[PDB]
Amino acid sequence: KTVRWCAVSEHEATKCQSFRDHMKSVIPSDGPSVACVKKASYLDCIRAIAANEADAVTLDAGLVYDAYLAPNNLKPVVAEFYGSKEDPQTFYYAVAVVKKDSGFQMNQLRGKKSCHTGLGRSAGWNIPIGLLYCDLPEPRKPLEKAVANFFSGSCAPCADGTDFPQLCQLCPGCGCSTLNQYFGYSGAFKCLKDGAGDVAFVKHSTIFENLANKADRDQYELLCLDNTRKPVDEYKDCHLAQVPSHTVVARSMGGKEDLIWELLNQAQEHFGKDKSKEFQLFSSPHGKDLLFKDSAHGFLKVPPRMDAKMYLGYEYVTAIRNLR
Ligand SMILES: O=C([O-])C(=O)[O-]
Ligand SMILES: [Fe+3]
Numbered sequence: 001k002t003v004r005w006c007a008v009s010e011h012e013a014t015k016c017q018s019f020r021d022h023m024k025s026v027i028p029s030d031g032p033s034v035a036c037v038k039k040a041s042y043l044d045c046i047r048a049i050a051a052n053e054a055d056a057v058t059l060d061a062g063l064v065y066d067a068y069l070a071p072n073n074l075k076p077v078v079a080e081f082y083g084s085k086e087d088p089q090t091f092y093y094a095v096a097v098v099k100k101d102s103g104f105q106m107n108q109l110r111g112k113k114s115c116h117t118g119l120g121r122s123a124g125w126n127i128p129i130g131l132l133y134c135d136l137p138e139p140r141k142p143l144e145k146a147v148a149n150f151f152s153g154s155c156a157p158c159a160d161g162t163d164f165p166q167l168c169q170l171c172p173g174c175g176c177s178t179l180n181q182y183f184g185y186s187g188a189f190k191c192l193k194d195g196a197g198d199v200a201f202v203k204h205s206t207i208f209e210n211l212a213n214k215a216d217r218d219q220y221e222l223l224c225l226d227n228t229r230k231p232v233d234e235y236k237d238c239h240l241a242q243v244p245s246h247t248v249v250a251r252s253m254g255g256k257e258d259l260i261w262e263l264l265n266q267a268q269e270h271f272g273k274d275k276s277k278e279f280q281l282f283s284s285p286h287g288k289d290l291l292f293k294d295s296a297h298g299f300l301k302v303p304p305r306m307d308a309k310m311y312l313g314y315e316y317v318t319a320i321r322n323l324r
Helices: 009-026 042-050 061-068 122-135 143-150 184-193 206-210 232-237 257-271 308-312 314-323
Strands: 002-008 033-039 057-059 075-083 091-099 114-116 199-203 220-223 229-231 241-244 247-250 296-301
Touching (some): 002 042, 002 057, 002 257, 033 042, 042 247, 075 257, 122 184, 122 241, 184 206, 247 257
Antiparallel strands (some): 057 247, 220 229
16 A cells, blocks of 8 residues: 655655655555655644544654644654664664853853754753753743743744744744754754854764764764763763654554555665665755654664553653653
8 A cells, every 4th residue: 555654844745755756666566655745844744644644754752742642642653763773772862062162061051042953852852941941930831931031042943933932033933844944953953053052952963964074073062961061972971861762653543554664664675774876765865854864774663552652661751741
């Protein structure tokens, strides 16, 4: 059958079209195929899947939690893994990247400018805001406003700029897709690189995906929880938290989870890491982290009928619930 993949905005749509075309060039007419459904935000994708208008979309773990809530109740079916095929990692590190010598520690973030990957995402929001919660000025609810008040300007993609204007000060409109150049891991990093923000809440691989030369990376550092700074290569001993890997989600009823796995498992063999000169699942000339994360090395099938809370784990679920 055909898996209707939900692509968010034009860059992902282009990659999705290529995914469909290349799969059809190596997969038999009776094999798994992919169709593309374009949406403006992951939120529209979640709704589309619940409404039987699409079948699959890859989501950051914080969003996987949101997708599980009523009335969507989507479930994780295929997880990304990082690191390498030999040593698959079903988690990653949330870090706070800053420029060398900017003069401030984690406990001095008040009044600084922040670059977030997006509202509700693991490394860019849930983890850092959860750690800074008590530092935020009262009233702490709504959370978005308290965060806007704490920093002196930010970019929080997907936030409502009408109600929380300061959250889009660094990226007018707070676009929830790659149409917003400061959206996502690499978008938040660019926000820091360009000088718009003072800190970028991203993952441990982010700076390495954007600066190939160590000499350039040496101009950046990481904020550690003990209020000290360390080189970007020392993230294992200077991170905010470890979080679950991104996962493809689907409906619980008539969700096609078996076909989604068949599609992706065959796809990673044909177009996975370093497999093809024609197409790549984990990179693209059209942008970074389109459909799947560039840092992913493959996919693993989620255990039978597992729901979001169980997949995420008690530690991360507690982190989200405590923040809220
Ligand atoms: O984890 C995050 O912040 C993301 O995926 O954007
Ligand atoms: Fe993420």
